[PDB]
């Protein structure tokens, strides 16, 4: 790729240290390319967040455009803005995804969560866990959110301190061999216990066993997302190591509050930068209005109890090829290759000219000058329609370049559509109808190995239905409404890309989804082989 | 915030910094200098890394002064130093040629010493096992000195001979422990045999309330860094015997023999010879400076020498070591010599003063060489010229001292090599007529080295010291080699500075004024650098 060059300045040596940490990589030179090390925009945000703790400033854009430490060190400035380090309290306007959430009027709205389980061979100290979670919920203000009704309207309120920060539970499983089902059953019960009006939105359970402890964490989706989880794992590891060393628990400086973010986004929603996007989104709505997804059984209003999860794994070799080597061929980003595979799959499996997919993005785009949310806990996730052309699948090189072209044309990684749909004043929405209702969701959460696998703890092998993706069966009420016909969710855990196809048995036969998922696997492997051959 | 280690390298470095510096919990963003670290402690970090078979250059720690940064420059050790017995000839290094060149009366009585104390008492059998392993392991301690046709020859004995002289004193039934240790250690200091005998004296003084362990070593085979390695290996050996483990000391770094040999080559290489114009420039300026003396007196002897001491209390000492260097990005010698300059400016009519500065001498001049854990006399001495005219404002004088120090090539190690080892055909017209009148010798910090789980610095160290101030180290018949000898160290969390002078050359009141001036100026420098 390029020869090892050691750092030669304070700034370079700090960037090398940050990059080694964020990526899972032991020795990085200052001419090593961020993307060739497997970097993506989430890892770029993580570098920016860590830099902030040295009072050094960088935007996500700087890193991905100048993708080596030697180049990017020029753009590194001193932070001149200090974010609010105090207690955040009071009203927080509903952000776009929060308006979508409440708009769906889900049955058991209080049971719509993300979760994970951590494992520590040496066991966890319950007094330390409680000390660290205290500091975490004090520091990450949005976790203290509650949801009230004024006049049938939802009001989001950020509590101050002094109240219930989390519910803590301890289970002694040290004298029974059914640890695995005991964690599955107890975590399912805890998932059902979220009080949106009052109680905390964070559930913490220690399971003590003969051979190590597990720490379950469940958080209502309203106050968290995938980046937020990586920050929480970081502050859990830091705080735990600080307590073990007899040091005060002390977490990095706060970035901007979810409250301030949401407030600025209310303003952004009616400013020129976003409204410039309307002609793109109108063109998209015009070109997608008729597209429709075929099903095996015509059924209305499916529930999560009807949903089944079909998983595809790429082995470590093909995963590392995808993350590190594949993008170099056509200068793509990983979403270009994953969506190229998705197109080839729908072209094979269906007779449609075109498919509209609901794409998720991290949604921490630099849309607001002097906003920094690189280390802020909250639900920032964006969702936006993408039209995949299915007609022109050959040759493979043209279909990749075409997918890349489609993705490059989208304004500001699609964050604008949901702002237009849920916040922008009606009079500023041009002729947008917002009638595009994708029936296929694609959600690549990104990489978690460096966040979850630390010196103190790791991803529990008994995570079971407690996951960060929409596939974990414990995260949602069985009575919750299905919000997409095909939910395709993926992440990198244990060195492998794991893609789950979630579907209603009441809408599709298993066979139909085995064919779609086998087609996706075959074409993604062909893209990786093509790009690396 | 405390930032914990993340990798193995970061973890070995936390552990090493905590032991070297004597700080309990160190984070990976803690600044080496802010924790009170200087270049001696950087050398001790490198020596300890070497014991883990990890390689670091001192300058990498000093330019990247946090554990997270310095870990990026830690590499696997490629080269393994000689672990076997060292034997045979060893060329005289520069300070050793200076020493023999002085032709001191009673040259066998020119020592460094220290006394350790252990409340539980010392097991004399464990002491003798540990010292056996120490003198087997630290080869230079077995050196001997002979004339071969009126020329001094230095030989590193192998094993099997006398490693050290051991003595034991039962003082458990008398109140006069303090005077008995002073009188007995003074006798033992007189007993070094340069031709054959060990150059290590070990005395156990047993008392009703704990024991004292006296160590004396002829200066020819030891220095300040060497003493710290000896304290470390004594603590390690003694802890192993207590746990009933084999006594086992870390890996050897390069022998004094090898080092002296490489030095003979470095002395006629271009890098060194390049410094000659710098050194002949310093010699030129030095010719003009004569230190005033209350009495013009010839051939003074150590028996005329009197010690006048000042101490900075712990709070001031801690500010100097940890918070003062930030102000103008200085090193500790900058602030100590700025104070010396202001002291001499106030005390004398001179426009400039020439001081002989001492340094540890373990500079990275020889790329093969690793002496980070080697026992020997490495000390460098070099002239430094202090401006006594441009003394205000204080901020300008600190910056001016720093700039003066920054123009010195390779921490002054070159001057003595040019003076004593470089072939006369390569020496330029260097006169070496620049006599030591004022010596400044800051030995550095010893609390983390001497204060251990097993033992500590004895309150009855008395005239047995690592500095030249200790009255027992030198024969009363030894010639004074410097009119004003200013020796400093950190002990008991305090900077202790001694002004040693011949009572034949100065009134006590004269040295009272200089030492009080020094104290006032250093206190003023510390308040200035930390008040702002």
PDB file of C-alpha atoms in Angstrom, chain A residues 124-343:
ATOM      1  CA  UNK A 124     -17.769  -7.686  37.280  1.00  0.00           C
ATOM      2  CA  UNK A 125     -17.900  -5.876  40.648  1.00  0.00           C
ATOM      3  CA  UNK A 126     -21.534  -4.676  41.106  1.00  0.00           C
ATOM      4  CA  UNK A 127     -20.409  -1.627  43.247  1.00  0.00           C
ATOM      5  CA  UNK A 128     -17.972  -0.519  40.427  1.00  0.00           C
ATOM      6  CA  UNK A 129     -20.658  -1.112  37.701  1.00  0.00           C
ATOM      7  CA  UNK A 130     -23.111   1.095  39.647  1.00  0.00           C
ATOM      8  CA  UNK A 131     -20.475   3.819  40.284  1.00  0.00           C
ATOM      9  CA  UNK A 132     -19.593   3.852  36.545  1.00  0.00           C
ATOM     10  CA  UNK A 133     -23.186   3.823  35.275  1.00  0.00           C
ATOM     11  CA  UNK A 134     -23.939   6.753  37.664  1.00  0.00           C
ATOM     12  CA  UNK A 135     -21.152   8.805  35.976  1.00  0.00           C
ATOM     13  CA  UNK A 136     -22.201   7.606  32.495  1.00  0.00           C
ATOM     14  CA  UNK A 137     -25.898   8.665  32.911  1.00  0.00           C
ATOM     15  CA  UNK A 138     -24.809  11.983  34.603  1.00  0.00           C
ATOM     16  CA  UNK A 139     -22.429  12.713  31.661  1.00  0.00           C
ATOM     17  CA  UNK A 140     -24.503  11.489  28.682  1.00  0.00           C
ATOM     18  CA  UNK A 141     -27.478  13.783  29.286  1.00  0.00           C
ATOM     19  CA  UNK A 142     -29.956  12.344  26.670  1.00  0.00           C
ATOM     20  CA  UNK A 143     -30.100   8.959  28.529  1.00  0.00           C
ATOM     21  CA  UNK A 144     -32.194  10.867  31.199  1.00  0.00           C
ATOM     22  CA  UNK A 145     -34.938  11.743  28.680  1.00  0.00           C
ATOM     23  CA  UNK A 146     -38.681  11.224  29.401  1.00  0.00           C
ATOM     24  CA  UNK A 147     -41.683  11.496  27.066  1.00  0.00           C
ATOM     25  CA  UNK A 148     -44.821  13.309  28.365  1.00  0.00           C
ATOM     26  CA  UNK A 149     -48.183  14.179  26.666  1.00  0.00           C
ATOM     27  CA  UNK A 150     -49.387  17.833  26.480  1.00  0.00           C
ATOM     28  CA  UNK A 151     -52.742  17.955  24.607  1.00  0.00           C
ATOM     29  CA  UNK A 152     -52.252  14.554  22.848  1.00  0.00           C
ATOM     30  CA  UNK A 153     -48.829  15.949  21.591  1.00  0.00           C
ATOM     31  CA  UNK A 154     -45.592  14.146  22.701  1.00  0.00           C
ATOM     32  CA  UNK A 155     -43.225  16.420  24.706  1.00  0.00           C
ATOM     33  CA  UNK A 156     -39.581  15.276  25.108  1.00  0.00           C
ATOM     34  CA  UNK A 157     -37.951  16.459  28.382  1.00  0.00           C
ATOM     35  CA  UNK A 158     -34.300  16.042  29.505  1.00  0.00           C
ATOM     36  CA  UNK A 159     -34.234  15.384  33.278  1.00  0.00           C
ATOM     37  CA  UNK A 160     -31.503  16.804  35.495  1.00  0.00           C
ATOM     38  CA  UNK A 161     -29.742  14.773  38.223  1.00  0.00           C
ATOM     39  CA  UNK A 162     -31.044  13.345  41.517  1.00  0.00           C
ATOM     40  CA  UNK A 163     -33.684  10.981  39.929  1.00  0.00           C
ATOM     41  CA  UNK A 164     -33.545   7.269  38.875  1.00  0.00           C
ATOM     42  CA  UNK A 165     -30.631   7.229  36.295  1.00  0.00           C
ATOM     43  CA  UNK A 166     -31.002   3.458  35.482  1.00  0.00           C
ATOM     44  CA  UNK A 167     -32.605   0.273  36.923  1.00  0.00           C
ATOM     45  CA  UNK A 168     -29.850  -2.127  38.178  1.00  0.00           C
ATOM     46  CA  UNK A 169     -30.462  -5.914  38.609  1.00  0.00           C
ATOM     47  CA  UNK A 170     -28.080  -8.608  39.914  1.00  0.00           C
ATOM     48  CA  UNK A 171     -28.681 -12.364  39.283  1.00  0.00           C
ATOM     49  CA  UNK A 172     -26.630 -15.056  41.070  1.00  0.00           C
ATOM     50  CA  UNK A 173     -26.372 -17.921  38.485  1.00  0.00           C
ATOM     51  CA  UNK A 174     -23.165 -19.414  40.040  1.00  0.00           C
ATOM     52  CA  UNK A 175     -24.856 -22.725  41.148  1.00  0.00           C
ATOM     53  CA  UNK A 176     -26.864 -23.626  37.987  1.00  0.00           C
ATOM     54  CA  UNK A 177     -25.832 -24.797  34.479  1.00  0.00           C
ATOM     55  CA  UNK A 178     -28.745 -23.010  32.643  1.00  0.00           C
ATOM     56  CA  UNK A 179     -26.898 -19.611  32.439  1.00  0.00           C
ATOM     57  CA  UNK A 180     -27.720 -19.350  28.682  1.00  0.00           C
ATOM     58  CA  UNK A 181     -31.548 -19.645  28.897  1.00  0.00           C
ATOM     59  CA  UNK A 182     -31.636 -17.748  32.264  1.00  0.00           C
ATOM     60  CA  UNK A 183     -29.964 -14.698  30.506  1.00  0.00           C
ATOM     61  CA  UNK A 184     -32.334 -15.012  27.488  1.00  0.00           C
ATOM     62  CA  UNK A 185     -35.454 -15.147  29.728  1.00  0.00           C
ATOM     63  CA  UNK A 186     -34.491 -12.475  32.264  1.00  0.00           C
ATOM     64  CA  UNK A 187     -33.253 -10.004  29.533  1.00  0.00           C
ATOM     65  CA  UNK A 188     -36.620 -10.492  27.681  1.00  0.00           C
ATOM     66  CA  UNK A 189     -38.476  -9.494  30.913  1.00  0.00           C
ATOM     67  CA  UNK A 190     -36.193  -6.440  31.464  1.00  0.00           C
ATOM     68  CA  UNK A 191     -36.796  -5.273  27.846  1.00  0.00           C
ATOM     69  CA  UNK A 192     -40.577  -5.029  28.694  1.00  0.00           C
ATOM     70  CA  UNK A 193     -39.956  -2.714  31.730  1.00  0.00           C
ATOM     71  CA  UNK A 194     -39.233   0.700  29.981  1.00  0.00           C
ATOM     72  CA  UNK A 195     -41.299   3.589  31.512  1.00  0.00           C
ATOM     73  CA  UNK A 196     -41.143   6.455  28.897  1.00  0.00           C
ATOM     74  CA  UNK A 197     -43.120   8.902  31.185  1.00  0.00           C
ATOM     75  CA  UNK A 198     -41.024   8.491  34.324  1.00  0.00           C
ATOM     76  CA  UNK A 199     -38.474   5.742  35.025  1.00  0.00           C
ATOM     77  CA  UNK A 200     -35.072   5.564  33.407  1.00  0.00           C
ATOM     78  CA  UNK A 201     -34.596   4.415  29.799  1.00  0.00           C
ATOM     79  CA  UNK A 202     -31.470   2.365  30.760  1.00  0.00           C
ATOM     80  CA  UNK A 203     -31.611  -1.255  32.109  1.00  0.00           C
ATOM     81  CA  UNK A 204     -28.414  -2.799  33.599  1.00  0.00           C
ATOM     82  CA  UNK A 205     -28.288  -6.507  34.633  1.00  0.00           C
ATOM     83  CA  UNK A 206     -25.261  -8.360  36.079  1.00  0.00           C
ATOM     84  CA  UNK A 207     -25.396 -12.194  35.653  1.00  0.00           C
ATOM     85  CA  UNK A 208     -22.765 -13.853  37.914  1.00  0.00           C
ATOM     86  CA  UNK A 209     -21.757 -17.429  36.891  1.00  0.00           C
ATOM     87  CA  UNK A 210     -19.200 -20.064  37.998  1.00  0.00           C
ATOM     88  CA  UNK A 211     -17.045 -18.933  34.999  1.00  0.00           C
ATOM     89  CA  UNK A 212     -17.240 -15.138  34.439  1.00  0.00           C
ATOM     90  CA  UNK A 213     -20.041 -12.488  34.586  1.00  0.00           C
ATOM     91  CA  UNK A 214     -22.297 -11.015  31.854  1.00  0.00           C
ATOM     92  CA  UNK A 215     -23.476  -7.375  31.856  1.00  0.00           C
ATOM     93  CA  UNK A 216     -26.725  -6.751  29.980  1.00  0.00           C
ATOM     94  CA  UNK A 217     -27.546  -3.189  28.840  1.00  0.00           C
ATOM     95  CA  UNK A 218     -30.888  -2.252  27.208  1.00  0.00           C
ATOM     96  CA  UNK A 219     -31.733   1.328  26.226  1.00  0.00           C
ATOM     97  CA  UNK A 220     -34.937   2.570  24.611  1.00  0.00           C
ATOM     98  CA  UNK A 221     -34.062   3.549  20.981  1.00  0.00           C
ATOM     99  CA  UNK A 222     -35.391   7.113  21.652  1.00  0.00           C
ATOM    100  CA  UNK A 223     -32.114   8.138  23.440  1.00  0.00           C
ATOM    101  CA  UNK A 224     -29.406   5.990  21.699  1.00  0.00           C
ATOM    102  CA  UNK A 225     -27.967   4.743  18.365  1.00  0.00           C
ATOM    103  CA  UNK A 226     -24.992   2.684  17.083  1.00  0.00           C
ATOM    104  CA  UNK A 227     -22.386   5.464  17.463  1.00  0.00           C
ATOM    105  CA  UNK A 228     -23.828   6.229  20.940  1.00  0.00           C
ATOM    106  CA  UNK A 229     -23.281   2.541  21.942  1.00  0.00           C
ATOM    107  CA  UNK A 230     -19.589   2.731  20.910  1.00  0.00           C
ATOM    108  CA  UNK A 231     -19.222   5.831  23.147  1.00  0.00           C
ATOM    109  CA  UNK A 232     -20.991   4.036  26.066  1.00  0.00           C
ATOM    110  CA  UNK A 233     -18.723   0.947  25.706  1.00  0.00           C
ATOM    111  CA  UNK A 234     -15.697   3.337  25.694  1.00  0.00           C
ATOM    112  CA  UNK A 235     -16.842   5.202  28.885  1.00  0.00           C
ATOM    113  CA  UNK A 236     -17.754   1.852  30.571  1.00  0.00           C
ATOM    114  CA  UNK A 237     -14.191   0.527  29.930  1.00  0.00           C
ATOM    115  CA  UNK A 238     -12.561   3.851  31.024  1.00  0.00           C
ATOM    116  CA  UNK A 239     -14.652   4.273  34.181  1.00  0.00           C
ATOM    117  CA  UNK A 240     -14.253   0.591  35.185  1.00  0.00           C
ATOM    118  CA  UNK A 241     -10.417   0.784  34.755  1.00  0.00           C
ATOM    119  CA  UNK A 242     -10.367   4.113  36.707  1.00  0.00           C
ATOM    120  CA  UNK A 243     -12.294   2.528  39.693  1.00  0.00           C
ATOM    121  CA  UNK A 244      -9.959  -0.577  39.613  1.00  0.00           C
ATOM    122  CA  UNK A 245      -6.877   1.775  39.794  1.00  0.00           C
ATOM    123  CA  UNK A 246      -8.413   3.695  42.771  1.00  0.00           C
ATOM    124  CA  UNK A 247      -8.814   6.835  40.568  1.00  0.00           C
ATOM    125  CA  UNK A 248     -11.860   9.125  40.234  1.00  0.00           C
ATOM    126  CA  UNK A 249     -14.272   8.103  37.448  1.00  0.00           C
ATOM    127  CA  UNK A 250     -13.787  10.952  34.910  1.00  0.00           C
ATOM    128  CA  UNK A 251     -15.139  10.805  31.296  1.00  0.00           C
ATOM    129  CA  UNK A 252     -13.983  12.983  28.329  1.00  0.00           C
ATOM    130  CA  UNK A 253     -15.393  16.510  27.809  1.00  0.00           C
ATOM    131  CA  UNK A 254     -19.025  16.505  26.499  1.00  0.00           C
ATOM    132  CA  UNK A 255     -19.625  17.520  22.903  1.00  0.00           C
ATOM    133  CA  UNK A 256     -22.872  19.416  22.101  1.00  0.00           C
ATOM    134  CA  UNK A 257     -26.051  18.276  23.918  1.00  0.00           C
ATOM    135  CA  UNK A 258     -28.776  16.366  22.029  1.00  0.00           C
ATOM    136  CA  UNK A 259     -30.965  19.325  23.270  1.00  0.00           C
ATOM    137  CA  UNK A 260     -28.760  21.988  21.453  1.00  0.00           C
ATOM    138  CA  UNK A 261     -28.496  19.722  18.387  1.00  0.00           C
ATOM    139  CA  UNK A 262     -32.254  19.286  18.151  1.00  0.00           C
ATOM    140  CA  UNK A 263     -32.788  23.098  18.593  1.00  0.00           C
ATOM    141  CA  UNK A 264     -30.290  23.929  15.771  1.00  0.00           C
ATOM    142  CA  UNK A 265     -31.933  21.255  13.581  1.00  0.00           C
ATOM    143  CA  UNK A 266     -35.318  23.022  14.065  1.00  0.00           C
ATOM    144  CA  UNK A 267     -33.629  26.149  12.525  1.00  0.00           C
ATOM    145  CA  UNK A 268     -31.758  24.195   9.755  1.00  0.00           C
ATOM    146  CA  UNK A 269     -35.142  22.713   8.650  1.00  0.00           C
ATOM    147  CA  UNK A 270     -36.271  26.095   7.160  1.00  0.00           C
ATOM    148  CA  UNK A 271     -32.864  27.486   5.960  1.00  0.00           C
ATOM    149  CA  UNK A 272     -31.590  27.765   2.358  1.00  0.00           C
ATOM    150  CA  UNK A 273     -29.032  24.849   2.482  1.00  0.00           C
ATOM    151  CA  UNK A 274     -31.782  22.206   3.073  1.00  0.00           C
ATOM    152  CA  UNK A 275     -34.461  23.785   0.761  1.00  0.00           C
ATOM    153  CA  UNK A 276     -31.874  23.725  -2.101  1.00  0.00           C
ATOM    154  CA  UNK A 277     -32.296  19.873  -1.849  1.00  0.00           C
ATOM    155  CA  UNK A 278     -36.053  19.934  -2.756  1.00  0.00           C
ATOM    156  CA  UNK A 279     -35.541  19.560  -6.590  1.00  0.00           C
ATOM    157  CA  UNK A 280     -33.386  16.391  -6.007  1.00  0.00           C
ATOM    158  CA  UNK A 281     -36.033  14.899  -3.624  1.00  0.00           C
ATOM    159  CA  UNK A 282     -38.952  15.886  -5.961  1.00  0.00           C
ATOM    160  CA  UNK A 283     -37.130  14.164  -8.886  1.00  0.00           C
ATOM    161  CA  UNK A 284     -36.693  11.078  -6.642  1.00  0.00           C
ATOM    162  CA  UNK A 285     -40.417  11.063  -5.615  1.00  0.00           C
ATOM    163  CA  UNK A 286     -41.440  11.465  -9.314  1.00  0.00           C
ATOM    164  CA  UNK A 287     -39.191   8.516 -10.446  1.00  0.00           C
ATOM    165  CA  UNK A 288     -40.340   6.170  -7.592  1.00  0.00           C
ATOM    166  CA  UNK A 289     -44.137   6.936  -7.318  1.00  0.00           C
ATOM    167  CA  UNK A 290     -45.283   3.656  -9.032  1.00  0.00           C
ATOM    168  CA  UNK A 291     -42.520   1.167  -7.915  1.00  0.00           C
ATOM    169  CA  UNK A 292     -44.041  -1.640  -5.715  1.00  0.00           C
ATOM    170  CA  UNK A 293     -42.573  -4.827  -4.038  1.00  0.00           C
ATOM    171  CA  UNK A 294     -44.047  -8.302  -4.784  1.00  0.00           C
ATOM    172  CA  UNK A 295     -44.986 -10.690  -1.893  1.00  0.00           C
ATOM    173  CA  UNK A 296     -46.062 -14.371  -1.667  1.00  0.00           C
ATOM    174  CA  UNK A 297     -49.111 -13.689   0.620  1.00  0.00           C
ATOM    175  CA  UNK A 298     -51.178 -10.447   0.346  1.00  0.00           C
ATOM    176  CA  UNK A 299     -51.514  -9.705   4.137  1.00  0.00           C
ATOM    177  CA  UNK A 300     -52.197  -6.395   5.973  1.00  0.00           C
ATOM    178  CA  UNK A 301     -50.869  -5.163   9.374  1.00  0.00           C
ATOM    179  CA  UNK A 302     -48.273  -7.876  10.335  1.00  0.00           C
ATOM    180  CA  UNK A 303     -46.862  -8.024  13.925  1.00  0.00           C
ATOM    181  CA  UNK A 304     -43.226  -8.700  15.123  1.00  0.00           C
ATOM    182  CA  UNK A 305     -44.310 -12.155  16.484  1.00  0.00           C
ATOM    183  CA  UNK A 306     -44.739 -13.117  12.742  1.00  0.00           C
ATOM    184  CA  UNK A 307     -41.121 -11.968  11.866  1.00  0.00           C
ATOM    185  CA  UNK A 308     -38.316 -14.531  11.227  1.00  0.00           C
ATOM    186  CA  UNK A 309     -34.540 -13.769  10.843  1.00  0.00           C
ATOM    187  CA  UNK A 310     -32.445 -15.347   7.987  1.00  0.00           C
ATOM    188  CA  UNK A 311     -28.698 -14.703   8.400  1.00  0.00           C
ATOM    189  CA  UNK A 312     -25.781 -14.613   5.919  1.00  0.00           C
ATOM    190  CA  UNK A 313     -22.147 -14.508   7.260  1.00  0.00           C
ATOM    191  CA  UNK A 314     -19.032 -13.634   5.209  1.00  0.00           C
ATOM    192  CA  UNK A 315     -16.012 -15.506   6.717  1.00  0.00           C
ATOM    193  CA  UNK A 316     -13.149 -13.371   8.154  1.00  0.00           C
ATOM    194  CA  UNK A 317     -11.132 -13.519   4.816  1.00  0.00           C
ATOM    195  CA  UNK A 318     -13.947 -12.193   2.561  1.00  0.00           C
ATOM    196  CA  UNK A 319     -14.932  -9.621   5.307  1.00  0.00           C
ATOM    197  CA  UNK A 320     -11.331  -8.206   5.484  1.00  0.00           C
ATOM    198  CA  UNK A 321     -11.171  -8.109   1.614  1.00  0.00           C
ATOM    199  CA  UNK A 322     -14.503  -6.137   1.590  1.00  0.00           C
ATOM    200  CA  UNK A 323     -13.436  -3.617   4.329  1.00  0.00           C
ATOM    201  CA  UNK A 324      -9.803  -3.021   3.336  1.00  0.00           C
ATOM    202  CA  UNK A 325      -9.117  -4.008  -0.334  1.00  0.00           C
ATOM    203  CA  UNK A 326     -12.358  -3.917  -2.423  1.00  0.00           C
ATOM    204  CA  UNK A 327     -13.003  -0.124  -2.440  1.00  0.00           C
ATOM    205  CA  UNK A 328      -9.682   0.614  -4.250  1.00  0.00           C
ATOM    206  CA  UNK A 329     -10.920  -0.792  -7.611  1.00  0.00           C
ATOM    207  CA  UNK A 330     -13.561   1.926  -8.438  1.00  0.00           C
ATOM    208  CA  UNK A 331     -12.763   4.317  -5.502  1.00  0.00           C
ATOM    209  CA  UNK A 332     -16.081   3.297  -3.835  1.00  0.00           C
ATOM    210  CA  UNK A 333     -17.298   3.459  -0.233  1.00  0.00           C
ATOM    211  CA  UNK A 334     -18.573   0.233   1.397  1.00  0.00           C
ATOM    212  CA  UNK A 335     -22.274   1.302   0.937  1.00  0.00           C
ATOM    213  CA  UNK A 336     -21.662   1.384  -2.885  1.00  0.00           C
ATOM    214  CA  UNK A 337     -20.577  -2.283  -2.830  1.00  0.00           C
ATOM    215  CA  UNK A 338     -23.287  -3.456  -0.363  1.00  0.00           C
ATOM    216  CA  UNK A 339     -26.046  -1.715  -2.441  1.00  0.00           C
ATOM    217  CA  UNK A 340     -24.517  -2.938  -5.762  1.00  0.00           C
ATOM    218  CA  UNK A 341     -24.903  -6.466  -4.254  1.00  0.00           C
ATOM    219  CA  UNK A 342     -28.493  -5.539  -3.170  1.00  0.00           C
ATOM    220  CA  UNK A 343     -29.394  -4.417  -6.729  1.00  0.00           C
TER     221      UNK A 343
END
